[PDB]
């Protein structure tokens, strides 16, 4: 169920029927790989298989050495996205801390350990290379006289070591911080059991499991420490504390007058475009809709990229002049043509000499737009063209509603219209019109006294009197 | 040593104790791979190992063919990031030039070759596939009758050739230009010796070597030419010509009035936020702090993204009204709530009905913010909440200083306050305020003293004179 409404009066459109999935917090897990401590490689044999093992063993050592060294968005605040993961990582460098983890995962690959003052973190041994080399390769490289391993062991070691190598690879060019988190950092099975053991509700575990590909784009892997044959990196996972609240997407486009003289027109655009989601009695507003990822009718966002607004903000759609919320807009005289592709259609702002049409796949051009702001639904329409720019529309199913109404730009007197307000809103523009109206009413009042008061009489030895608005010589009436 | 100061007066905060690392230049090295020239593959043998070699040999040829075809940021200038790498690449296309290099690296893998009029470039043959194929696979594929190579050679060839394939892979999907420079382009050992052999000071070498992962992220690899069995790509490395000069980070947030009536509030924000570093008697300013990367107390930036300012720019911190530098600000009425997480704490801009709190890990909420702009240190605080947005604070050690002062937004008369100057400054705002203030200072002066003047005598055929404050017919005195 997805529906959409277009408002002609304000040149904007709302798509609804979406369900929320909001990242509200962060969970930090600690992922470990048990390592082997092999300094020198003792073997003088030039057997081909053993020769390969030392080269492969060297890639392991080399990997170790490398790892050893290590629109309205502008209104948003500024966070430290991995501040929490790093903090957990800082605790891990303290002495004895690593020793705690190694002991916990002694008899299991999964265990919970609480750090410092109360934080409970999940721990995961995803690869035991210590055990593999010490029970497989130790007999072949712990002695001069060397046990020429079967060819199948060489292959097996490359497979097991490869994960370490790829993991090592990612961190070296990302300064210990990667995103999205690859399947090298954490396999699907690893992630799924991680999700199951997380201190979260059942609803969240299910949401994450059916959308694991999204979890990766919103996760961070943080390289932390290598010490005492334990490799550990912190993985910071999104917590979606808000799921399945109604969401809607607001699309906007410039609304201008259509007078013949090109330099005489004024324009206005709603600046409050973006994603909106009901959230905890408020409305979460995401001005940069590109920070959200859409999966069918579910929308995943990050509250770090949101404002918290009164729910009355929705009113701007039905009544942009409502007295309860100051709907945000920008003004200009830049009447250029463009289009905004919506969920279920397309808004067309066609002005000037721009060629604007809509076509169907098989029929060709079926509608020609006149000057103004208009809309077409995706039913029976496949493409829209504005000037030399071709737009393909979304073909998703859903009903559109065209809400007719007078373009609000018509409600403004161009002689006092503030055409240079960028970070504006309805009340502010009105407010400014008031200052502009004040300054013309009063200026006229002052000019309303240019001639009704009397001037100086000429400076000569003669006397004067007043008549018909001008000075007359006194000698005249004598 | 990191300290921080919050200025209540300007809703901003300065973090200090940082050390500089500014990329000021570029060094271009030429990395080469010596190639084998193998047209046709002569073998009718269907041996599995030899069959594998032709498939592996084909990936090599295919790789060759692919390679053969081959806030205040708006104030910044515009550079050409790889202009330097490209120029060297242009030099590499001349005929006598390649022969020089090929000859230079004949008996060594490391060599200096001087190009055109004086540029000395370091050259590096990192892989000799020519030698490997010509001494290993040559006996098996230069003849119909083919020598069924041991299974270990197939693997080794796959290992050695593999480096070439990824490099080709990277270049093929990046149009010959990659960044960061991967370890396929340049291994850790290779890079480290390159830095050491570079014509730079000891200070730079030490700094770069302990932070090679950053060096990689700030480097470019530029695919240049394949000719006469030599493959060469240019690697453009950052030169950090300014090190260990003091740096500081400026954080800012909106400072608004807190009157009861909604939409009646006015706001102001310092626009000069970003990283600052002392540099050559001036101050280098990086407005988009995301272009800089911080590791502990070292800060890496790129001068291509900086402005060069007089050191008096620092005065905006102590006296935003100082007469010597025009501190830059923007104004608006959009009083939405948010927080800016600093190095050692958090700035909170809390307005309206927004819920704003700070919590501890174990204790929970320990401070509730009132309306206005405020700050809390990271000592004893773990998280901050503004509206529906959760912020994790930075847990780095360091002292904060709360600098008390009247919020400067209180110094403005709201009736003449220009709330919609975006690209503004202190002096610029004052100038406009004076003009709005001037026309009221004078209009009231004129409306007074206007009534001290005499109105026009009635306009008829009769003459008039003044007496007792009124006009009297001249006929009376006759």
């Amino acid at each position, epitope marked *: 169920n997805i529906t959409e409404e277009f408002y002609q009066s304000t040149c904007s459109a709302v798509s609804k029927g979406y369900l929320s999935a909001l990242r*509200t*917090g*962060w*969970y930090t897990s600690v992922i470990t790989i048990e390592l082997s401590n092999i300094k020198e490689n003792k073997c003088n044999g030039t057997d081909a298989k053993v020769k390969l093992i030392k080269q492969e063993l060297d890639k392991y050592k080399n990997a170790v050495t490398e790892l050893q060294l290590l629109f309205l968005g502008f209104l948003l605040g500024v966070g430290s996205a991995i501040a929490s993961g790093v903090a957990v990582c800082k605790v891990l460098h303290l002495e004895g801390e690593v020793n705690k983890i190694k002991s916990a995962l002694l008899s299991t690959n999964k265990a919970v350990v*609480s750090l410092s003052n*109360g*934080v*409970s973190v999940l721990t995961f041994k995803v690869l035991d290379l210590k055990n593999y080399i010490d029970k497989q390769l130790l007999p072949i490289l712990n002695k001069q006289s060397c046990s020429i391993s079967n060819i199948e062991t060489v292959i097996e070691f490359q497979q097991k070591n490869n994960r370490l190598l790829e993991i090592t690879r990612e961190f070296s060019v990302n300064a210990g911080v990667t995103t999205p988190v690859s399947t090298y950092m954490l396999t699907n099975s690893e992630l799924l059991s991680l999700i199951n*053991d*997380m*201190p*979260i*509700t*059942n*609803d*969240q575990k299910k949401l994450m499991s059916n959308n694991v590909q999204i979890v990766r784009q919103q996760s961070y892997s943080i390289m932390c420490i290598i010490k005492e044959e334990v490799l550990a990196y912190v993985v910071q996972l999104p*917590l979606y*504390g*808000v799921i*399945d609240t109604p969401c809607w997407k607001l699309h906007t486009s410039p609304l201008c007058t259509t007078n013949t003289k090109e330099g005489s027109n004024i324009c206005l655009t709603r600046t409050d475009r973006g994603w909106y989601c009901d*959230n*905890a*009695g*408020s409305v*979460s507003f995401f001005p940069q809709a590109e920070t959200c990822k859409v999966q069918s009718n579910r929308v995943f966002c990050d*509250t770090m990229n949101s404002l*918290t607004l009164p729910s009355e903000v929705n009113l701007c759609n039905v009544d942009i002049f409502n007295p309860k919320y100051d709907c945000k807009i920008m003004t200009s005289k830049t009447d250029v043509s463009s289009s905004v592709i919506t969920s279920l259609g397309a808004i067309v702002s066609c002005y000037g000499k721009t060629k604007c049409t809509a076509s169907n796949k098989n029929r060709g051009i079926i509608k020609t737009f006149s000057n103004g702001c208009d809309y077409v639904s995706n039913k029976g329409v496949d493409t829209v063209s504005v000037g030399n720019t071709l737009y393909y529309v979304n073909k998703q199913e859903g009903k559109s509603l065209y809400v007719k109404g007078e373009p609000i730009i018509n409600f403004y007197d161009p002689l006092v219209f503030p055409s240079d307000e960028f970070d504006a809103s309805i009340s502010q523009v009105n407010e400014k019109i008031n200052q502009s109206l004040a300054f013309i009413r009063k200026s006229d009042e002052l000019l309303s006294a240019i001639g009704g008061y009397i001037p100086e009489a000429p400076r000569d030895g003669q006397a004067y009197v007043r008549k018909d608005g001008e000075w007359v010589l006194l000698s005249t009436f004598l | 040593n990191i300290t921080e100061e919050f200025y209540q007066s300007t809703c901003s905060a300065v973090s200090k104790g940082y050390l500089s690392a500014l990329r000021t230049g570029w060094y271009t090295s030429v990395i080469t791979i010596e190639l084998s020239n193998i047209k046709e593959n002569k073998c009718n043998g269907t041996d599995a190992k030899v069959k594998l070699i032709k498939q592996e040999l084909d990936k090599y040829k295919n790789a060759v063919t692919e390679l053969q075809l081959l806030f205040l940021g708006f104030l910044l200038g515009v550079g050409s990031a790889i202009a330097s790498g490209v120029a060297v690449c242009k030099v590499l296309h001349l005929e006598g030039e390649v022969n020089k290099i090929k000859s230079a690296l004949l008996s060594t893998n490391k060599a200096v070759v001087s190009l055109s009029n004086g540029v000395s470039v370091l050259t590096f043959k990192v892989l000799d596939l020519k030698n490997y194929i010509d001494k290993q696979l040559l006996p098996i594929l230069n003849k119909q009758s083919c020598s069924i190579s041991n299974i270990e050679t197939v693997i080794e060839f796959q290992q050695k050739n593999n480096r070439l394939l990824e490099i080709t892979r990277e270049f093929s999907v990046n149009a010959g230009v990659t960044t960061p420079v991967s370890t396929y382009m340049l291994t850790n050992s290779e890079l480290l010796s390159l830095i050491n052999d570079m014509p730079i000071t000891n200070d730079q070498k030490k700094l770069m070597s302990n932070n090679v992962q950053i060096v990689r992220q700030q480097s470019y690899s530029i695919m240049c030419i394949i000719k006469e069995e030599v493959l060469a790509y240019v690697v453009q490395l950052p030169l950090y010509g300014v090190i260990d000069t003091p740096c500081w980070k400026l954080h800012t947030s909106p400072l608004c009035t807190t009157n009861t009536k909604e939409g009646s509030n006015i706001c102001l924000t310092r626009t000069d936020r970003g990283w600052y570093c002392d540099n050559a008697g001036s101050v280098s300013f990086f407005p988009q702090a995301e272009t800089c990367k911080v590791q502990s107390n070292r800060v890496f930036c790129d001068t291509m993204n900086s402005l060069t300012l007089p050191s008096e720019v620092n005065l905006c911190n102590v006296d935003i009204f100082n007469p010597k530098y025009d501190c830059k600000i923007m104004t608006s009425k959009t009083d939405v709530s948010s927080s800016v997480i600093t190095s050692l704490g958090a700035i909170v801009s809390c307005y309206g009905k927004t*819920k704003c*709190t700070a*919590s501890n*890990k*174990n204790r*929970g*909420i320990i401070k509730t913010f009132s309306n206005g702009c405020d700050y809390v240190s990271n000592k004893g605080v*773990d*998280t901050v*909440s503004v*509206g*529906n*947005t*959760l912020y994790y604070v930075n847990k780095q050690e360091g002292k904060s200083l709360y600098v008390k002062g009247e919020p400067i937004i209180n110094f403005y008369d709201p009736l003449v306050f220009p709330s919609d100057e975006f690209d503004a400054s202190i002096s610029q705002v004052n100038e406009k305020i004076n003009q709005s203030l001037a026309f009221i200072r004078k209009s009231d002066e004129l409306l007074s003293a206007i009534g001290g003047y005499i109105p026009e005598a009635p306009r008829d055929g009769q003459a008039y004179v003044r007496k007792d404050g009124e006009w009297v017919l001249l006929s009376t005195f006759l």
Partner: nanobody, 123 residues
Framework: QVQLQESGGGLVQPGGSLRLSCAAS????????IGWFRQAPGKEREGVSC????????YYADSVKGRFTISRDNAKNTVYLQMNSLKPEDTAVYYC??????????????????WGKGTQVTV
């Protein structure tokens, strides 16, 4: 304004049952997540159960999962923790806690914003 008050604590025999109640005041449950925590004597405090007010979706830590069940009454603005088959090792002080769903960051002592004053349970 916002306050929580737990009740229902007392002495139980092993294998016995007990229900705790958590009265919310100053807010409504719908906008929040409600959690139950415990601290046994001398031991660090550990999470036990969280619930979503809206959907009623639930979370049980591994240690008590199956034996303990949590429920909520929106009308009474109260959250209940039913405990079945109590063991002496379950002896602890039980705290009620909550966080705005807007600020939700997981169940766990480091993830709570408001705390009740507690009620003592002894098996």
């Amino acid at each position: 304004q916002v306050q929580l008050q737990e009740s229902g604590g007392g002495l139980v025999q092993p294998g016995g049952s007990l229900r705790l109640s958590c009265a919310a005041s100053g807010f409504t449950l719908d906008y929040y997540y409600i959690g139950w925590f415990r601290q046994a004597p001398g031991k660090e405090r550990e999470g036990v159960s969280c619930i979503s007010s809206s959907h009623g979706s639930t979370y049980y830590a591994d240690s008590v999962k199956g034996r303990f069940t949590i429920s909520r009454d929106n009308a009474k603005n109260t959250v209940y923790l039913q405990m079945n088959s109590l063991k002496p090792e379950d002896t602890a002080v039980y705290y009620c806690a909550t966080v705005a769903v807007a600020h939700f960051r997981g169940c766990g002592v480091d993830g709570m914003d408001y705390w009740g004053k507690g009620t003592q349970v002894t098996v």
